[PDB]
Amino acid sequence: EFGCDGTLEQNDTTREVFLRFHNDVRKFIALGIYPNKVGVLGPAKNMYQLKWSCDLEEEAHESIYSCSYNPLLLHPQSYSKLLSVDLPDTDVVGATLEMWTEFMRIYGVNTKTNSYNPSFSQFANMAYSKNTKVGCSYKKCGGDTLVTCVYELGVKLPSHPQMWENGPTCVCVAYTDSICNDNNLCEY
Amino acid sequence: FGCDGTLEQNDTTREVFLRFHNDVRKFIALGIYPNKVGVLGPAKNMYQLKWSCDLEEEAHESIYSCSYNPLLLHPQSYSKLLSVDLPDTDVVGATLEMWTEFMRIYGVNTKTNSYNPSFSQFANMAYSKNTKVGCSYKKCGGDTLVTCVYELGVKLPSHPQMWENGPTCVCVAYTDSICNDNNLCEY
Ligand SMILES: *[C@@H]1O[C@H](CO)[C@@H](O[C@@H]2O[C@H](CO)[C@@H](O[C@@H]3O[C@H](CO)[C@@H](O)[C@H](O)[C@H]3NC(C)=O)[C@H](O)[C@H]2NC(C)=O)[C@H](O[C@@H]2O[C@@H](C)[C@@H](O)[C@@H](O)[C@@H]2O)[C@H]1NC(C)=O
Ligand SMILES: *[C@@H]1O[C@H](CO)[C@@H](O[C@@H]2O[C@H](CO)[C@@H](O)[C@H](O)[C@H]2NC(C)=O)[C@H](O[C@@H]2O[C@@H](C)[C@@H](O)[C@@H](O)[C@@H]2O)[C@H]1NC(C)=O
């Protein structure tokens, strides 16, 4: 599920944190039980399972390599700079991902449109229903640690801000020959 | 710690909670804790926190039903997290880091060090005159609840100051205070 050989300064423990965090968020949106600011997100039809992409992880790694964020702009990308602390790497990674979702919970999703909002831009990239690939990276840059995820597909702003379509769990039709896996997420 | 109660927590996460708080507080006291721009502090009357099993009880009780219901006896910080398949210490660490990162998103006004609801958890953690904290967490299926209870905190509107600007180791808020080896006040 990973197999990323490169000089990426990361091993699979944090990659699994990244990957399963995304797919847990997406499963609970699809099931209609992820908590909004008030109430719940979802259910969503067309919410696809994410797979790791080593190419996208390289894009994530390259954007923070110099210790100043510089995205390649080939793919949607979420980024945050956190204070480096004397705790394990899973803690920074976890803190970033939790923070990305708390932005959403602090501001609140309109669950009629499920539109992107700049105040939870990272959550929108993480929840974008029709994406199927993610790659993330982090780098300690002295007093700060940069954490960033890159996605194959994302919202297209401003015209197409919808993060996911309201619909029944396991309705998987956005790609031909899609099935719903045991995670309650679509795959193709 | 010595918290005997049915608190569903052991001392390893208690230490992460406590040490994290006192690191932040001493970095503010020394004037080296990063703000959004620049640094926070130095602060006078920044007291070291001690654990309180009573406050931990108040924390544990507010979340044991998996819906947040504070007792409202003491200032309290709370977050509902997405559950992660990581050791509990790392979920606690991630939460505490996240609480500080809110502050650096909005930024503290270092002329006033005023409370800001947008970083309420950092504010509760940084409140200089508090000396006791109790924290708890509970895995609730897909989500995890994490919360800290403080004996003292800001009082709005009358006392919005998280800490007062001033020299490290000035410890006069309470009589018979001293500055310990952590450069934090205690009595
Ligand atoms: C990704 O890298 C991290 C950081 O190196 C790995 O986590 C570390 O894994 C090592 C073991 O390979 C842990 O060390 C050992 O800890 C135990 C308990 O104290 C002791 O028996 C042993 O003496 C100790 N070794 C030494 C010399 O210290 C280490 O504690 C652990 N965490 C950190 C922050 O260093 C990680 O390994 C994965 O996670 C650990 C927790 C184990 O489950 C391990 O089997 C896993 O592979 C690396 N991930 C991968 C996939 O390799
Ligand atoms: C609190 O609960 C933790 C989870 O059960 C304990 O960690 C576990 O300790 C085992 C040895 O007793 C060790 O083999 C396990 O890998 C470890 N599990 C995890 C997820 O870390 C913890 O014990 C403390 O921490 C571990 C890492 C060791 O250093 C122990 O010697 C420690 O006591 C429990 N804490 C206490 C104070 O009992």
Author numbering:
A (entry chain A): 2 to 189
B (entry chain B): 3 to 189
Publication text:
The first known HpVAL structure, HpVAL-4, refined to 1.9 Å is reported. HpVAL-4 was produced as a homogeneously glycosylated protein in leaves of Nicotiana benthamiana infiltrated with recombinant plasmids, making this plant expression platform amenable for the production of biological products. The overall topology of HpVAL-4 is a three layered αβα sandwich between a short N-terminal loop and a C-terminal cysteine rich extension. While the refined model has four monomers of HpVAL-4 in the asymmetric unit, this tetramer is likely an artefact of crystallisation as SEC-MALS analysis indicates that HpVAL-4 is a monomer in solution. The predicted N-linked glycosylation site Asn12 is glycosylated for all four monomers. The surface plot of HpVAL-4 reveals a large central CAP cavity of 1732.64 Å3, which is bordered by the first beta strand (β1) and the third and fourth alpha helices (α2,α4), and opens into a C-terminal loop. HpVAL-4 shares a conserved C-terminal extension with Na-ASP-2 that has two strands, which are stabilised by two disulfide bonds. The flexible N-terminal loops of both proteins also have a conserved disulfide bond with alpha helix 2. HpVAL-4 has a large central cavity that lacks the prototypical CAP cavity tetrad, which means it will be incapable of binding divalent cations. The amino acid residues in the CAP cavity of HpVAL-4 are more similar to those in the amino terminal CAP domain of the two CAP Na-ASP-1.
Proteomic analysis of ES products of adult H. polygyrus revealed that the most abundant proteins are members of the venom allergen-like protein (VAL) family, and among the major ones is H. polygyrus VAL-4 (HpVAL-4). VALs are members of the superfamily that is known as CAP (cysteine-rich secretory protein/antigen 5/pathogenesis related-1) or SCP/TAPS (Sperm-coating protein/Tpx/antigen 5/pathogenesis related-1/Sc7). There are >30 secreted Heligmosomoides polygyrus VAL proteins (HpVALs) and these proteins are characterised by having either one or two 15 kDa CAP (cysteine-rich secretory protein (CRISP)/antigen 5/pathogenesis related-1) domains. HpVAL-4 has both palmitate-binding and sterol-binding cavities and is able to complement the in vivo sterol export phenotype of yeast mutants lacking their endogenous CAP proteins.
